[PDB]
């Protein structure tokens, strides 16, 4: 409803998992239960971004878009000892299987060759929240351009509870990245996601669009579209107004 | 004067030229240091260091 | 005499136009330098051209430069035969690059003042773009 | 004599049986123990690991402590194995059983240090087990080896014995082991012409005759061989997987390893203890999920319960018990040098499918693995240990024509053990 | 010159620097009480032609002068054959 006093949702998302399913169409040994992910297109009526923000907007989710085995790296200020105690203390080896400390990860990972090897040996890389924007060196287009940018995890106090808060946390939220452009898209989830699971997601994610990217929210939103890696840009809803919004906001 | 002919080091040998087991001495920490330190720890009780 | 084009690649990072020709007018005049860069973004493609009024010139720094230890990376310089050497080459050489902020000028062209022809001109047949997604279904 | 009990045998074997954890006899140690007790030379034919370890075993170890044989009194049992790796499973079991007693024990086989083989039997080996191949060379060559008070010989699976190639060195070992008053045995799976005939040169006249009786491969090469294999066993870590391999040191090693680098497995190795052995097959079989490491040599004869993957990580020493062992999923890991087993598997009359993997799934830890090899002693022990014997067991394969150790990279092979260059392994 | 960059960063430590660490363990030890192994440059030419046939060695670093050149003569071609 907050997009135009409507909300065109669950039929359209219903038919895009159908669609998804019926295109179907050696045998391989590496397998994974990588499915097509769930891509939520936005227009908006003017540049949502000044510059690019290497820092992933935590959206928040209730059905996590990464799988529960993906394998963390945690990036944290050094020392480095202490907070692979703490994980350990709070059972997150299976979870956060490595601990890097800042410098040791400028230190022991300097080579583009290194840097692609740490960046393939994980699935999500967890950054403390206070090293982050040392992250965009050190790591470089390699992850920063090739899909792994490191999330924000807060544990500047350090205990077990809060680590594994976040931790839940990081993987329960999506990430999106602002660059200056009109049109961007977010990551709903995967195909696995049910009609309603999908929905919940993208009406979750356009409350946090509303607010935190789109300045003027529904008003700056000119259209939205439901699409996968492949698939078409199925419009979930138009702007009714945008008639008068244009005119309104390009004199 | 004939130009030197390396009629066996034209090859790499790929495996070490002992086949004798590592001593444990290079995976610990030294023996010689830690007497060393012991006999420091000494003179230090005794005033002399 | 002839004169003499020199290639350089694996340049390290830091070791650009201004750089190249102050290091190399030491062995000799230099008369046209051009490094590559990318188009969108203007950076470093980290391998140059350079021209020396003598081939002896270019034969004397391509034997003193080539596999030099520079910066974690070997430098590797060679001369090109001027039969594959092309007259076009060249072009743009010693004149700075001008980085096009073209997510900028978007910017400004997404958000610049309009006129009421202009957003008819904008609007056209939203409908019709609508419907050939609809066609699509 | 339904159990070990029944058997008149002395306290100290007793209390090595009970420790073992052997309580009922196999119906192959009923027909033989009891006759072997008696001193009568006996030809015996039996199936895959119906028991006959423990069926030559007992009566020639209670035969040692009745004559109350010393070192000085030298050899006294000479136990013969047609591979090394059943020389070992033979040599451990001896261990456990002697482990109450006075009598020495000793191996001599191939691909092992002679010189330190020589230096042991100058000593004094009351128990020899031995492979035909370096025992004939210790009985000619090695002074001061003392073998003309042996009162008992044993030969375990001579059928294979002969296909490996040992007819002219079984028949010298014959020619200079002294045959008067010596208790003699041949166990056998299969009955051929040769073994009757080895059995009548050997065996005394009238010996008593004891009678109880779909494949996917992958093309890895050897450098990327243990990779491959720990990319799966974690991609398939909520399933039941057994991995067979060639050597209870390579079995060691990478039971090691995988738990060093937090990969909880199991292995029927354990500290090569028979009670241990049993009881984690047994934890195998009970847990729905999990993941167990063994040799061929282990897996014959014991029941494989219901697994989702059956690894052959290593090649097989059997391939003609191999190919009817199968009679959820089958994997058997390949090198491109040893692409001859597809003809002989076709030969064979085996359907086979052949598994493929992408090399960015592939976990790229061979920096970080060789780090931690170098970094620990006891991995680093084992790992020139499991490398020298997948090599001996390899030299010592029965293919020739296919497993061939010359066409075998040594660089690569390393490489899979966690080497940056192949250790100084002799042969 | 950039070999020798990287040699400097792996001096072993002077006799001097070596007992005042040392010393800094005896204090421990007496008062009140793990280690990372060290890293360094290898040398003695008996060492590291060890080092060599044991193929540990990374880069070998010649002497152009040693007075008896038998004492190295061989080396290059050693480090060729390993």
Same mark, same amino acid.
């Given at each position: 409803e907050l997009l135009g006093s409507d909300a065109p949702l669950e039929k359209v998302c219903s038919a895009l998992l159908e669609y998804e399913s019926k295109r179907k169409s050696n045998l391989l040994e590496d397998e994974q239960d990588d499915i097509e992910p769930v891509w939520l297109q936005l227009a908006t009526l003017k540049f949502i971004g000044n510059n690019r923000k290497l820092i992933p907007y935590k959206i928040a989710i209730k059905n996590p878009v990464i799988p529960s085995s993906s394998e963390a790296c945690l990036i944290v200020k050094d020392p480095q000892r202490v907070y692979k105690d703490l994980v350990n203390e709070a059972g997150l080896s299976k979870v956060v299987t490595r601990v890097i400390g800042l410098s040791k990860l400028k230190a022991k990972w300097n080579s583009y060759e290194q840097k692609r090897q740490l960046r393939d040996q994980f699935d999500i890389f967890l950054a403390d929240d206070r090293v982050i924007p040392m992250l965009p060196r050190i790591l470089g287009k390699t992850f920063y351009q090739k899909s792994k940018v490191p999330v924000p995890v =807060?544990?500047? =106090?350090?205990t077990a509870e809060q680590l594994k808060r976040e931790v839940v946390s990081a993987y329960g939220a999506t990430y999106f990245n602002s660059a200056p452009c009109s049109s961007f898209m977010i990551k709903c989830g995967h195909v696995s996601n049910t009609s309603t699971e999908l929905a919940e997601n993208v009406e979750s994610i356009l409350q946090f669009v509303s607010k935190h990217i789109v300045p003027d929210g529904a008003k700056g939103i000119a259209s939205i579209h439901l699409k996968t890696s492949q698939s078409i840009a199925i419009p979930l809803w138009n702007n009714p107004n945008l008639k008068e919004l244009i005119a309104s906001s390009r004199k | 004067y004939p130009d030197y002919d390396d009629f066996f080091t034209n090859t790499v040998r790929e495996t070490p030229l002992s086949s004798a087991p590592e001593p444990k001495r290079r995976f610990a920490p030294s023996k010689h240091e830690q007497k060393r330190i012991l006999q420091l720890a000494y003179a230090i009780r005794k005033g002399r260091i | 005499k002839k004169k003499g084009v020199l290639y350089v690649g694996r340049l390290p990072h830091g070791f650009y136009e201004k750089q190249m020709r102050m290091y190399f007018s030491q062995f000799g005049p230099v008369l046209r330098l051009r490094m590559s860069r990318n188009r969108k973004t203007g950076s470093s493609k980290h391998y140059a051209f350079i021209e020396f009024e003598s081939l002896d010139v270019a034969n004397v720094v391509a034997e003193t430069m080539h596999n030099y230890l520079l910066y974690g990376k070997l430098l590797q310089c060679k001369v090109i035969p001027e039969d594959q050497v092309h007259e076009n080459m060249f072009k743009g050489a010693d004149v700075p690059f001008k980085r096009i902020p073209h997510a900028t000028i978007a910017r400004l062209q997404h958000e610049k003042p309009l006129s009421k022809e202009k957003a008819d001109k904008l609007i056209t047949r939203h409908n019709r773009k609508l419907k050939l997604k609809k066609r699509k279904l | 004599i339904e159990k070990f009990s029944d058997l008149q045998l002395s306290e100290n074997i007793q209390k090595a049986i009970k420790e073992m954890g052997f309580e009922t006899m196999t119906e192959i140690q009923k027909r033989s123990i009891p006759p072997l007790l008696a001193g009568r030379d006996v030809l015996g034919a039996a199936k895959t690991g119906s028991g006959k370890t423990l069926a030559f075993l007992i009566p020639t170890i209670e035969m040692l402590y009745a004559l109350k044989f010393?070192?000085?009194? #030298?050899? #006294?049992v000479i136990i013969i194995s047609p591979t090394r790796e059943l020389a070992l499973q033979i040599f451990g079991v001896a261990k456990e059983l002697l482990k109450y007693h006075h009598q020495t024990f000793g191996i001599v086989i191939g691909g092992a240090n002679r010189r330190a083989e020589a230096d042991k039997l100058v000593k004094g080996v009351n128990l020899l087990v031995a492979t035909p191949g370096r025992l004939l060379d210790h009985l000619q060559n090695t002074k001061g080896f003392v073998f003309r008070n042996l009162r008992s010989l044993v030969i375990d699976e001579a059928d294979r014995i002969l296909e490996i190639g040992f007819e002219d060195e079984m028949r010298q070992i014959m020619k200079i082991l002294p045959s008067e008053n010596r208790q003699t045995l041949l166990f056998s799976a299969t009955q051929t012409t040769k073994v009757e005939d080895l059995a009548r040169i050997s065996?005394?006249?009238g010996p008593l005759y004891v009678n109880v009786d779909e494949q996917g491969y992958v093309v890895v090469d050897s450098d990327k061989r243990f990779l491959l294999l720990f990319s799966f066993l974690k991609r398939n870590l909520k399933k039941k997987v057994i991995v067979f391999m060639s050597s209870c040191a390579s079995v060691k090693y990478m039971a090691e390893l995988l738990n060093y680098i937090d990969l909880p497995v199991l292995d029927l190795h354990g500290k090569q203890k028979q009670q241990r052995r049993t009881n984690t097959f047994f934890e195998f079989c009970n847990a729905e999920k999990g993941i167990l490491l063994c040799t061929n040599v282990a897996a014959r004869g014991l029941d494989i319960p219901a697994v989702d993957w059956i690894v052959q990580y290593d090649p097989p020493d059997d391939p003609r018990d191999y190919i009817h062992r199968v009679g959820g999923k089958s994997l058997m890991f390949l090198a491109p040098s040893e692409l001859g087993f597809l003809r002989y598997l076709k030969t064979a009359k085996v359907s086979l499918n052949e598994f493929e993997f992408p090399a960015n799934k592939v976990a790229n830890v061979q920096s970080q693995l060789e780090k931690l090899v170098s970094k620990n002693y006891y991995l680093q022990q084992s790992a020139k240990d499991g490398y020298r014997s997948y090599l001996q067991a390899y030299a010592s394969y029965s293919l020739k024509s296919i497993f061939d150790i010359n066409k075998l990279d040594l660089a690569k092979v390393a490489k899979s053990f966690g080497f940056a260059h192949p250790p100084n392994v002799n042969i | 010159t950039q070999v020798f960059k990287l040699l400097n960063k792996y001096r072993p430590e002077t006799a001097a620097e070596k007992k005042q660490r040392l010393v800094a363990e005896a204090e421990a030890v007496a008062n009140g009480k793990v280690s990372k192994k060290p890293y360094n440059v290898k040398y003695g030419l008996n060492h590291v032609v060890a080092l060599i046939e044991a193929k540990k060695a990374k880069l070998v670093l010649i002497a152009? !002068?040693? !007075?008896?050149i038998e004492l190295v003569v061989f080396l290059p071609a050693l480090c060729k054959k390993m």
């Open positions: =807060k544990i500047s =106090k350090g | - | - | 010393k070192p000085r009194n #030298g050899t #006294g065996l005394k006249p | 152009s !002068d040693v !007075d008896p």
